[model samples]
Target chain A: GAMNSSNYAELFNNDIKLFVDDTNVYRVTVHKTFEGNVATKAINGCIFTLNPKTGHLFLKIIHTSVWAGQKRLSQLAKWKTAEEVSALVRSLPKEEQPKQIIVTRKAMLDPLEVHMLDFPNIAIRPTELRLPFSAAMSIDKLSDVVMKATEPQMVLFNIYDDWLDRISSYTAFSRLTLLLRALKTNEESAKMILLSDPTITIKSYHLWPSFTDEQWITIESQMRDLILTEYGRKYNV
Target chain B: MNTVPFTSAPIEVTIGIDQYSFNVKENQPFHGIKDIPIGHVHVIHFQHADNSSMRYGYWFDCRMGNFYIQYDPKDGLYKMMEERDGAKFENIVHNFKERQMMVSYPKIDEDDTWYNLTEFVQMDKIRKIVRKDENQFSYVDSSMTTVQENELSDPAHSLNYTVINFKSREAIRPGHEMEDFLDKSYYLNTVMLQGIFKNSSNYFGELQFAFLNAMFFGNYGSSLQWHAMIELICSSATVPKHMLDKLDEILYYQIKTLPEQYSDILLNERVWNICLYSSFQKNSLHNTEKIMENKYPELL
Candidate 1:
């Protein structure tokens, strides 16, 4: 079965890698590892792909890896004293530090901006979802599902669902920043729901077992720390 | 001794000719409807101070109605009386008569303050005695002032006056008064009048908003060119929730009462109807369309 076009969960998987070819063309690839040997396959042009085993697509970029990635790059650019450089040079055989510094466009835009190029529907869906539409549209029909017992719980789920869809759109940088803000404001509501039902799952991706407890925990942690981490990374905080 | 300059709690303030009392929260407007006739006096008693001061002005609509008076207890004096009232008055006044100033005592015979003010209005330090009217007179305040001659004027600082006769069936094309009030430059006119500028919580404010909102649709497709004015009036943050509700209520009934042929414009061109219904029920525009489809299936 084909993966849901809107599910962005696959981006978060550990096996994926983003590459920019010599032609300046970008592609996201997925890899598998077995018995100390690794194999890789390109996931076509789409950033999101179906997990054959789970029959679902997910865009999960774990925050722990993001933090680790930040530090890994930071150490390479760390300020080095003359003595430290000399000692490091003595310890190493060769170096290409100067040649490695390639100045690309003032700065690279977010990877998600480039990733949405293949998915035109995903790119333009958010513009329609927002307020003040040019034409009339209807709201989500409540009759489709069994509502949460409490109004607050229902609201929490709806907002969290909204955040998932908004972030998945990857339509614009400004929209992404606003998504972060909307989630940031409703952080307390998310916490309240978690406190009441920590083991609950998010069904937006439609995986068999849905989002795991660990993933949910990671998502909440990301919600609390995304502003600090993502924005701080931009400002070198 | 150091003192706090502002308060978080609602402060009781007395205002209007009858000395109507209301509670005003710090930084919040207290809107009300009062017969603020010419020469009406309001004695505001500031909190944290023993002294009270008098403010005289004719009331029309949503003036800010906020008077921030700071009190100093050391020497027991009130400072920083920020008076937020009135537009700049223009000359060329009519319907007035001049008479000798009469003397009357306060706290003895009676206060002559109201009598003098009702008799005359001072414009640019020039006093003109108000001619008595028995429902047969109109006054127009000029739209421009001579002060700061050759320099651009501030529309917000300008004032215009009109008598909105409740009995008049047709919209009057009365001289400069209607022109000034409806002028796009005087966009703040609606907010300043009808008390929507400062107070939107009260019934009076909401009713004024309803009338203003309905007026836009009434002039729809007309040469009134009210789109800009309507936009300015509805853009006010002082617009209360109930005002929108009242508009929706009126629109819903208007839809039911009017002929079926009028449904197209009533449902489609009524921007206020769309705005009120779209927001009131926590429904999106799409959802509103669906609801309206169910209610008025013929239009869609």
Candidate 2:
């Protein structure tokens, strides 16, 4: 049969990838105002990126107003001489140091004025799933099934008892395939049943013949009777 | 300490009253609001030193108009004072009366003794009045000081005032008679008043009713015109389909005879374009067509 080879379990394997594109790069501009002044004291610039595929995020700060009016020395020169300047600045008395500095528009370039010359790419891995549509279906079914279950434990006893009955009628492997398919198709129904029978342990003992086919048959018969009496109208069986 | 000899070109600050269109000549006298332009003002940017003896000089252009002395502290001081009042420095209006003298009394210690010569401006005259209660000298200092005039070049020596006369204009213009249609207030008031009359005309006596209705709603076509015009005013932001339908109805019925005037006011290219754009955006062409057909089914 097609079902023998095309097992539902194979659908669980999945892979997902996301790509970040810089299509419309926006510059984040920060306007710092004095504590009580209505006007902006300074403006700074930053860059942000959004991954189109996964919707991941990244932000990078570019320039600040503090370095305004200072000559833009070569990065290499600044790196070499920064230590001496840093030490001198640190040595000044806290109170004697400059109390305030006004950063005006002339001192810095507005982010809107800067041309976006470079575009860099960043990649990220997102959570993946197989049979994604099936997940949505199962979630829908589970909500409906739980709403119908009156007594919680009755859900578990009925599911396990049904599984046993099916196992007696078919091979253990066939029973497992049917159970997994039922779970994928109606997750809410399977989940409610599992919740009811939390103590029902699945072990090799339950699969061995020593457990007796008759015992399985007897359990299945009783569960079938209960379902027929209680929920027969729901399934119309 | 040796003082620098005060010598420079005379500085003039013009404060006009009502001449709103006055242009600043090299040494013209300050006039009124009508002669000056809007937003052209003097700017003073000054800082005070901790030392008690430091004096700053400011030069002004006095010939153009009456000038006032405005002492502007460094931006930091303005911000600090504004913070105490839960406001911002820029939001504060700094307008000083003409010929008024100002002195900064910084609270350096318990007593107001640490007085630094923050700013000195030269005007055309000076008056010294002694107050017996405070035992303090009120010096109405004025002069086009050569010292203050020369200090204008120093970036730190700050003195500024925003000239406001250039912006103020008389609300009334000559030869512009008040026409109800042209006057915005009359147009709005007539619409509201007539709407009230239409809603309550049945309750009054025949004579009173006729007079009120004639004055208010006698011009039925004007009411429609006013309605259409009111729709334009009310729906400036988002014009609903019902408003367009009402406007179209008014335009069809009220101005049927005067096609040119109707076309000019109601069916102008801009108006039709706006209607088309509004209908397309709102997806209400069917609704609009229904109203238009009901109102003017035969019009081409």
Candidate 3:
């Protein structure tokens, strides 16, 4: 337990450890009390890894803890995995063969305290609420941390598809708006995220939350004005 | 009320920017009005943009018996009008509303042209539907915890777990021999605790009790109601627990388990919980998209 590792940090009181492997894969190792059994702690955590060649991302549980009580750790790991993974992925080039990898120095985690509507989903499972730490914080600082930890350019503004990819994209856009509102950023800054190619993909047109033709017309015009600048003469002509 | 059907000659309208593909001279027999169909609102179906896959239509508002046609630009149907009270304008308007049949008018006066409503406003049902005793209500689970804690005496001379009948406002013991939850509508789950905790002037319990048995014996269908209940309980009350972890479990069971067939619910349950835990902004985004998809299909 006391052995020192090069790419690992003791995350929480010798129980949780953040690790990175030679392949640039990132993981959070959690050793926690099993099923409210304080006698001994077991291993359960989150992983953010990708195919070294394909760059396709994968987020998963390090080990599925049957203990329902330990699930809170798993849920925390999922968001941490998402936050760190996105930041890690963005730092790399579009293609393969990037040896270096950068991870979050201080991860922004989900506060245990949640709303009543959200409580059943967060604590209960295995069909019973495992209980919670009642996580809370002054989200003003949390908002800033989340914004810096995510990439705005690749984020999707209107995320309809609920998936692992959308989680990262959704968080980035969601937090960006919060930061925008807090800092009172210009309206154009928020508009820029929507007009990005990543946000307005061809696939989104057929997706559940696709923009109406009228909505698209507004977006299309805004995009047209942004892209068709005098500087475009060199790129377009 | 009955309406007569008839064949009409073709008509054409040319606009500079026709949102609906301007119907060219086409041969399609139109329904003619026999008389006025009592209580039945007259609606016109417009074929738009040659993409028959998309439907275009507007239903007459049945309020005050007035034939005011409201147009949603997202619906791809524009409202046609002329001057305030011209003879031809009155003729066309009367025919359009009274005829209760398919009809079209070609380009006429510029004033009688189609006008776009600045915003499409659906009747805000939130005001009338909201209950006066919303604050007085409480969500009590149908478990032994409620019985043991509250010291509720058994009406049957013996204590048994009870499920709620949303429509009847009854909290009777659950059984197939009697009125069981299996035959009940999923909307019963959507009924807030006010429906059940009527006698308890100020009821109290974790809202989970309200939905405790929903996934168990409750009839299966889309997770819409479950999601609705999740959003409903969270939106309505101040929960006791400090951590959002309870929300993950509350949300996961409904989304992942209730509509077991839907693939998206499983994925959404995980991400949805994260959003709720992360920030209200993220949670708001998820909810807004869901609201638009459920209530504003035309926009999609």
Q: Over the stretch A148-210, how does candidate 1's per-residue lDDT look in tens digits?
A: 212111111122233344244233222333433533444454334334555664465321113
DockQ of each: 0.00, 0.01, 0.01
By DockQ, the better pick of 1 and 3 is 3
TM-score of each: 0.19, 0.14, 0.23
> What digit string (tens of lDDT, one per residue) describes model 3 on residues B42-117?
3333433444432322223223222322333464333322133446434654575565554333324452112211
lDDT of 2 by residue, B1-300 (tens): 001111111223222111111123222332111111222221111122332121122222223233222323342111101122313211221211131222221123452111111011112211111112221111111111222233334322211111111001121122221121123232222332233223111111111211111122122222232333333322233334454454343333323323242333333343333443442222333443454445444342
Two-chain DockQ for model 2: 0.01
- lDDT (tens digit, per residue) of candidate 2 on A66-184: 23454432321222122222232244465422221111112111111111101011111111222111221133232333334332211111212224343432254233333444455
Question: Where does candidate 1 stray beyond 4 Å?
Answer: A1-237, B1-198, B201-218, B221-250, B269-295, B298-300
Residue B184's C-alpha lDDT in candidate 2? 28
lDDT of 3 by residue, A1-237 (tens): 122233122211222122221111122334456576444343333332422122232333333333336445433443334344434444555453222222222232221111111122222111011111011011222222223432222221221233224334324323322432322322353345344545444342222223445654565454444444423654685
Candidate 1 lDDT, tens digit per residue, B164-256? 221121111222222322232233334234433343223222232222222222213121112222333343334445554443343343333
Winning candidate number (lDDT): 3
